[PDB]
């Protein structure tokens, strides 16, 4: 078989649970004395861990409370109206997903809104694990950690200057990850970077590796093991001398963050009061500590915002033109003007034609909604017939910000 | 011999087949209102995709139609004489590769000439599937994929303009990759960068993989599969549910082109005059209407020399 | 049955081996023309080749010839005293490290000094084959390899002028890896690295991999097999064709000096006095001829210090004043004030608080033992209350120059 793989299985007791998600923004400490803006799910970076079993039946409830548009995006098997690309859930707005899960192992969420890396660079990522229903995994001390890239100063810089082991920088070398001498350890690794590969390494032990988080595969030993963007991995590992030990990314996200130190115990009563009993039966999470220290060193200053999803009326002077320009960097919002000309007015039976002039992919989307673009790529033309009379107004589903009309006579 | 690996098998009918490619610059169209200049072979970027099957007698005659030196050098097994590093091919010549196709698999060809990374920056690559003679991969809708790293202003360029599939960035999102539901789905990826490496990810499905495109593996599960420069992989899945997905590499890859949208069909036959028989017997080829995509938007204009000597 | 793995077995006949490093300053050429200041373990970069038997007894004398602090972090199983993190090692002191090893496979070793990636830049990094017990791998022609980052200019740059194959980039295009027709080879790549990853590709045949150098894995094949930072890889290959082939990391690092001319000869004949029998019974090793090589090319200059002592800090005056900065950028000992005031006067009872500025981790350490903050990551904080009259003398741990007085009266 394995013995060691947990093969695809038909949960006898299923449960059905529901999560409440918001998009919001926050300032956070994200390093000692560095204060930054960032784009959460619930106020924390990384996102709340979800747990559940294989099998189980899931609901999210997800709010946008901010003035972008955002989505959720799980992987793991699910359909199309519930992949979080289609629809774009606009400032104000709600939506509903909803899935059973079809398999077990270690997935994560993030955002899919574009640019994505943005949104995913801003924090909008957590952790999901999904437990096998054939039987639990061997009984452990389970920790999760995400590796990502975070700048303050420029969210979209190659090279960051912080590479956090769960949203903070080096938070695990003042609060040590607690292990005890001979019992065995899980950690759930979620790669989550956009521009270097992760190659976690732990000191003086060897690791058992299920590649790819996926628990239908034989787990093979590592020193280290290479996680790319958007992977996972989970990894179990015993340490058998108390002391103190390092585990890190490999590379220069060591210097920036991507360190912490394992502290092994003799045993584990100093953890009676810390550890919760786990949903794979027998183990001892660790998860709500480190969800708790998240929170105490981010020491998260909510955003609210008013009016979510209002803005000004269009009263520009209309235009006779049949060729709109969709304007370089509206993808920012300082751009007051998103297309050009932002008002324009044809005659009935005119071909108009929007040239995407950004970097970034945007759509011309009616709100009456009697003609929709779908994505225009970045310098691509997207042309629509105007038959018939009447005034429309217009907007990019992506950019809640942006907006147009179009006058037919 | 486990169910799902395909060991090296001797062909009992093996067939002799013959390539010509030209390495040939020019201009192609690389995104929306992007031109820049490319050395090819025959006239796109990626090249054309090789196929053929397990021990097979292979012939690739290389006519080198530029100015500057060249190769093919080919991923897999050969002997010196074929392994493109020496000798180079000057401007005018022909060179003709031949060897037997010793093992199944996904594999590369690309040009070796100093400096390497410089011509495969130019578009000087291409995809090799060579099918197994043991028995066909299951029946499935089979489609290519590179995934490179190209700036039109500066080939060299650490971080690239674009991270295209099969060259032409985003073209994947205007005409999405059709596959059927419940239908079984193959892509032949082949990582062909030079600086980052390429997390290739799947929307909503789990990816039966297996390592460096070699069949003799046991396969593997992945939500996201690292594919290094250099490396291939062949990627099998089933999508159950009608509607539109993406798949891309995952990271900066995919905001500069490096992302393709999935139309899930309920049912085929839109694509009976898109298809072809595949050369893993009972599958269906999308290959061919790929390459013809390639070149409709690459819309490649070459560069005639006169001299060649 | 899985008979293509090597499981771990209690050696019955351990030997017991002890081995002399130094941390020693030198030029040494990089590349033709090019000479350039490193760190190294006696003098070559990489260090020496390590190669034993799973079980034996290993002792390693490590003695720091240099004024920076330095230790040796081996990767695979051993206790914190042995980890190379816990002490650094000052200058001109020595450290004992002993283990029993515990597992066979291709390790690594390398300095874990603060900041870790400008070390290995600089050099001191090498590679451990620990050969398995069990019984020996195949007969084969026996190489290794490490893939390293070297810039002679600026040692942190990102992407650097070099991608040496064994620290001197380009040996192998003019001195040839040479194996034999029909004859298995066997590979021990390092990868180490800190910022790209290696894709590491061998011409006109398929590589069977140990994945992470663990012999007890299953092996695989590849055309290419990407090693990430900090892991290693067992490859194992036969040409059956006479003549000229290449192997290389497949990138840009391949035009930087990571590449290799492969020449497969008709018999073994030519290198019948070059190669040793290999502590793989069996196999033949080149590993002396690839070090010779190594040494021969590089032409090391080393540089010996005899008077390492600690000494104090010097400073033209004295603040009575209860905080201290440490300052930015004082892990370069260019920046001569490495705690701001160096000197400082307070009355017993006084408690000193000292804030990390600068953003690497530092430490403020009695030169007796009164006192230890041990880590300080940049921007905290670390305060200590002087109960009693004296006089203090302390240092950073983890960069010697760093130096400051209290007087307390
Ligand atoms: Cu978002
Ligand atoms: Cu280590
Ligand atoms: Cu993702
Ligand atoms: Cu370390
Ligand atoms: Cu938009
Ligand atoms: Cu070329
Ligand atoms: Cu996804
Ligand atoms: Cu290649
Ligand atoms: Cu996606
Ligand atoms: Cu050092
Ligand atoms: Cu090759
Ligand atoms: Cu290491
Ligand atoms: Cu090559
Ligand atoms: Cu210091």
Chains 1, 3 share one sequence.
């Not at chain 1, 060729?323 to 998103?338: A, G």
């Amino acid at each position: 078989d394995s013995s060691d793989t947990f093969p695809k299985f038909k949960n006898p007791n299923p449960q059905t649970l529901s999560y409440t998600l918001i998009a919001q923004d926050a300032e956070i400490e994200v390093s000692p004395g560095v204060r930054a803006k960032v784009w959460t799910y619930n106020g924390t970076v990384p996102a709340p861990t979800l747990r559940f079993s294989e099998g189980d039946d899931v609901t999210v409830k997800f709010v946008n409370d901010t003035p972008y548009a955002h989505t959720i995006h799980f992987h793991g098997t699910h359909d199309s109206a519930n992949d979080g690309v289609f629809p774009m859930i606009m400032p104000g707005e709600e939506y509903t997903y909803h899935f059973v899960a079809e398999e077990a192992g270690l997935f994560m969420y993030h955002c899919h809104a574009f640019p994505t890396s943005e949104h995913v660079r801003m924090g909008m990522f957590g952790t999901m694990i999904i437990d096998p229903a054939i039987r639990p995994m061997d009984p452990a001390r389970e920790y999760f950690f995400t590796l990502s890239e975070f700048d303050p100063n420029n969210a979209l810089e190659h090279f960051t200057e912080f590479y956090p082991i769960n949203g903070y920088a080096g938070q695990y070398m003042d609060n040590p990850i607690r292990v005890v001498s001979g019992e065995l350890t899980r950690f759930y690794v979620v790669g989550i970077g956009g521009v270097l590969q992760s190659p976690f390494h732990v000191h003086s032990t060897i690791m058992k590796v299920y590649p790819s988080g996926i628990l239908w595969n034989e787990p093979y030993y590592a020193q280290t093991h290479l996680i790319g963007n958007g992977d996972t991995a989970i990894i179990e590992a015993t340490w058998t001398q108390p002391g103190m030990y390092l585990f890190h990314v490999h590379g220069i996200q060591e210097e920036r963050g991507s360190m912490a130190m394992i502290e092994v115990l003799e045993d584990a009563s100093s953890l009676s009061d810390v550890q919760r009993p786990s949903n794979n039966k027998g183990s001892y999470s660790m998860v709500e500590w480190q969800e708790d220290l998240i929170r105490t060193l981010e020491q998260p200053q909510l955003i609210s915002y008013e009016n979510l999803g209002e803005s000004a009326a269009i009263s520009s002077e209309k235009v006779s033109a049949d060729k709109v320009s969709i304007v370089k960097d509206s993808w920012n919002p300082e751009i007051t003007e998103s297309y050009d000309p932002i008002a324009i007015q044809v005659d009935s039976g005119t071909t108009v034609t929007w040239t995407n002039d950004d970097s970034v992919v945007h759509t011309v989307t009616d709100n009456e909604n009697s003609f929709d673009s779908g994505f225009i790529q970045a310098g691509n033309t997207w042309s629509y017939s105007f038959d018939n009379p009447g005034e429309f107004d217009y907007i990019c589903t992506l950019h809640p910000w942006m907006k147009g009309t179009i006058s037919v006579n | 011999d486990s169910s799902d690996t395909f060991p090296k098998f001797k062909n009992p009918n093996p067939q002799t087949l013959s390539y010509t490619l030209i390495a040939q610059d020019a201009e192609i169209e690389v995104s929306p209102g992007v031109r820049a200049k490319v050395w090819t072979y025959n006239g796109t970027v990626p090249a054309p995709t090789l196929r053929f099957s397990e021990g097979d007698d292979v012939t690739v005659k290389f006519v080198n139609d530029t100015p500057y030196a060249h190769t093919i050098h080919f991923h897999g097994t050969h002997d010196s004489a074929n392994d493109g590093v020496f000798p180079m091919i000057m401007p005018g010549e022909e060179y003709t590769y031949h060897f037997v196709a010793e093992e199944a698999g996904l594999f590369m060809y690309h040009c070796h000439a100093f400096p390497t990374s410089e011509h495969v920056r130019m578009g000087m690559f291409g995809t090799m599937i060579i099918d197994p003679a043991i028995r066909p991969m299951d029946p499935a809708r089979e489609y290519f994929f590179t995934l490179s790293e190209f700036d039109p202003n500066n080939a060299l360029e650490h971080f690239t303009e674009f991270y295209p599939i099969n060259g032409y960035a985003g073209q994947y999102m205007d005409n999405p990759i059709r596959v059927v539901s419940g239908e079984l789905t193959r892509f032949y990826v082949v990582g062909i960068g030079g600086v980052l490496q390429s997390p290739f990810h799947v929307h909503s499905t789990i990816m039966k993989v297996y390592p460096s495109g070699i069949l003799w593996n046991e396969p593997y599960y992945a939500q996201t599969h690292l594919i290094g420069n250099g490396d291939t992989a062949i990627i099998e899945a089933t999508w159950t549910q009608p509607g539109m997905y993406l798949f891309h590499v995952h990271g900066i890859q995919e905001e500069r082109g490096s992302m393709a949208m999935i139309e899930v069909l309920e049912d085929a036959s839109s694509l009976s005059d898109v298809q072809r028989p595949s050369n893993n017997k009972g599958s269906y080829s999308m290959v061919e209407w790929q390459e013809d995509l390639i070149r409709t938007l690459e819309q490649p204009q070459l560069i005639s020399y006169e001299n060649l000597g």
